[PDB]
Design a protein around this ligand. Sequence first.
Ligand SMILES: CO[C@@H]1O[C@H](CO)[C@H](O)[C@H](OC(=O)c2ccc(C)cc2)[C@@H]1OC(=O)c1ccc(Cl)cc1[N+](=O)[O-]
Ligand SMILES: [Cl-]
Ligand SMILES: [Cl-]
Length: 138
Amino acid sequence: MLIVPYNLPLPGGVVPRMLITILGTVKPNANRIALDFQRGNDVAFHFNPRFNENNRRVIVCNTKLDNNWGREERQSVFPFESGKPFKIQVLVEPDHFKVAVNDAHLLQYNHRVKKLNEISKLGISGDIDLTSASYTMI
Ligand SMILES: CO[C@@H]1O[C@H](CO)[C@H](O)[C@H](OC(=O)c2ccc(C)cc2)[C@@H]1OC(=O)c1ccc(Cl)cc1[N+](=O)[O-]
Ligand SMILES: [Cl-]
Ligand SMILES: [Cl-]
């Protein structure tokens, strides 16, 4: 397993047609997972499965600019399960990030950070055993 939290450099930032694939297994009794696509200290796209927010499972998505979180976008479809292997695929499209989990479309997140080629790192954190993290151009 890779060491979490894990930084995946994205050389030259992201660009449409770039596919990021994360393979891992959720720990037992998980509380949270996070993917943070970063532009220096800013978070262009925060993808945050929460296993217990007032006894509900929810994925929260947001952007952090100058240390300030913005308006959350929330998804009640929740494909993750404590103890089970998952695949997250993040495809950069021209107007949004498109996210699929276990080969099923989950959500899309409109680009708030516009300088895509400056989103140069992906942080992977939370209650997972991380198997692999990679990218390819499709
Ligand atoms: C309002 O709360 C914030 O919302 C943001 C999204 O809008 C982030 O998700 C923040 O989290 C972190 O930036 C962050 C959190 C932990 C670390 C180890 C590093 C960074 C934080 O979320 C929680 O604290 C939170 C609030 C309620 C619940 Cl139930 C779960 C979470 N959470 O997953 O941390
Ligand atoms: Cl590692
Ligand atoms: Cl920008």
